[PDB]
Design a protein around this ligand. Structure first.
Ligand SMILES: C[C@H]1CC2(CCN(C(=O)c3ncccc3O)CC2)c2c1n(CC(=O)Nc1ccc(C(F)(F)F)cc1Cl)c1nc(N3CCOCC3)nn1c2=O
Ligand SMILES: [Zn+2]
Length: 432
């Protein structure tokens, strides 16, 4: 019988079309053969590609185990070398080793009692994936150095990585000496995994594991407190933003802390100018500004001395602010990936927030003419596909939450979202 009906008339859209660079044919064959999947989710590819091609440290926040294991199991299987998984979760490690064996991936649990059986075979390069406790790993840095020299370690995964922080709710003394991994193995990337989206605990993990410029990702969350809306521009900045404003004592303000993302530096200045006329507490943020001025706006926003930052998408990576009540995209966003990163900064305190896109078909990020100028065929086609996916989202009458979760998240996240989805607080299209 037919197992899916994903194909639609008027589209040749695979999940691979929205990955940069594209997975090659052997990478797809490997994924199918050893993991029984046809495609990578964007976050899975971000982690896998950063490990394989850049040897980059990662902190991967993953709310659940749905789609998690692929990020650290796939790279060593693809290159045919060795990946180490450090975890205190014995039963889960046993379950994953058996699943790998049943997929014809040579994997084992290494510990003191298991060493007589597996250690010689690990040293000779017969295992793709080795699971160890932090206690065992801490007394065997010599072994890891030999495996790096003789085989080459694709990555070290540290699961329950929040256990390294004495400031968290689940501290393990066993994790303390994992700080030595980067000293013993400076060229081996670490993928630190945790379920906690706490910026405080992320900083502790990066410090304690000595991670260098780690790629930070955060997935598996439904974010029921984010309301999504897409609305047409009206041809006038004050006309467009007036609906978001309330008059208080001869000055106007937003409901709460607000970020307005604009495509151009020019537009950030234009929008700031119109809000300044209303004596609204706001500041401009773009790369054309000085280091001190940018640093000042950051601190002032964090201290609630300004209510609104009008910014390019240069603003956001350095802000851990939990009470962002409103994100406005003033102009179509660059693509769905950037849009996802930007709306994800809203309502991290878990209270009701709104994310509005104000767009016109004439917006710079819907202009195909700028993309036709791209002479690299592969990059041109990717940029056109990303613009088309963004345009399809903006134009849609379907649930905005369903579109975003379908693209970025494991299907399990959609099952958790069925409560918020279709209600008055989900999105503009669910309210109608
Ligand atoms: C988007 C990612 C990336 C980011 C962290 C990385 N980042 C940086 O700037 C950054 N980079 C480097 C260093 C430090 C940094 O801050 C951008 C923001 C982040 C994400 N998420 C996930 C998410 O929101 N998914 C999500 C789910 C549903 C919906 C929808 F459709 F229903 F509306 C939309 C989206 Cl986008 C996330 N989720 C929670 N929460 C989960 C629930 O508890 C509260 C925190 N926080 N959070 C995040 O911070
Ligand atoms: Zn909806």
């Amino acid at each position: 019988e037919d197992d899916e009906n994903e194909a639609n008339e008027g589209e040749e859209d695979d999940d691979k079309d929205f990955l940069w660079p594209a997975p090659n044919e052997e990478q797809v064959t490997c994924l199918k053969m050893y993991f029984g999947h046809s495609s990578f989710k964007p976050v899975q590819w971000k982690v896998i590609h950063s490990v394989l091609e850049e040897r980059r440290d990662n902190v991967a926040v993953m709310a659940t185990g749905y789609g998690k294991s692929l990020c650290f199991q796939y790279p060593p299987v693809y290159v045919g070398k060795i990946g180490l998984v450090i975890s205190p979760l014995i039963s889960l490690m046993e379950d994953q080793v058996l699943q790998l064996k049943m997929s014809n991936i040579p994997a084992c649990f290494l510990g003191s009692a298991q060493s007589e059986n597996v250690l010689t075979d690990i040293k000779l390069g017969k295992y793709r994936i080795v699971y160890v406790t932090p206690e065992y790993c801490s007394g065997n840095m010599g072994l890891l150095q030999q495996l790096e020299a003789d085989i080459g370690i694709t990555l070290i995964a540290v699961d329950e990585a929040h256990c390294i922080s004495e400031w968290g709710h689940d501290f393990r003394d066993s994790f303390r000496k994992l700080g030595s991994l980067k000293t013993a193995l400076p060229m081996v990337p670490i993928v630190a995994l945790t379920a906690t989206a706490s910026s405080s605990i992320r900083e502790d993990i990066v410090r304690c594991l000595n991670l260098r410029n780690p790629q930070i990702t955060c997935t598996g969350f439904d974010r029921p407190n984010l309301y999504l809306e897409v609305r047409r521009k009206t041809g006038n900045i004050l006309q467009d933003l007036q609906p978001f404003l309330v008059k208080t004592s001869s000055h106007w303000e937003f409901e709460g802390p607000t970020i307005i993302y604009c495509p151009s530096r020019k537009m950030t200045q234009q929008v700031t100018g119109e809000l300044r006329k209303l004596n609204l507490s706001c500041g401009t943020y773009h790369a054309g500004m000085s280091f001190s001025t940018r640093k000042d706006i950051h601190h002032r926003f964090v201290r609630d001395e300004i209510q609104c930052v009008i910014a390019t998408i240069a603003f956001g990576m350095g802000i851990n602010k939990a009470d962002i009540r409103q994100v406005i995209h003033y102009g179509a966003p660059k693509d769905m990936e950037s849009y996802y990163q930007e709306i994800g900064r809203a309502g991290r305190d878990g209270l009701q927030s709104s994310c509005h896109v104000l767009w016109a078909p004439a917006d710079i990020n819907l202009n195909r003419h700028l993309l036709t100028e791209i002479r690299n065929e592969k990059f041109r086609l990717y940029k056109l596909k990303m613009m088309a996916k963004m345009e399809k989202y903006l134009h849609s009458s379907r649930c905005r939450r369903q579109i975003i979760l379908s693209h970025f998240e494991d299907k399990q996240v959609q099952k958790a979202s069925l409560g918020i989805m279709g209600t008055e607080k989900c999105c503009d299209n669910c309210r109608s």
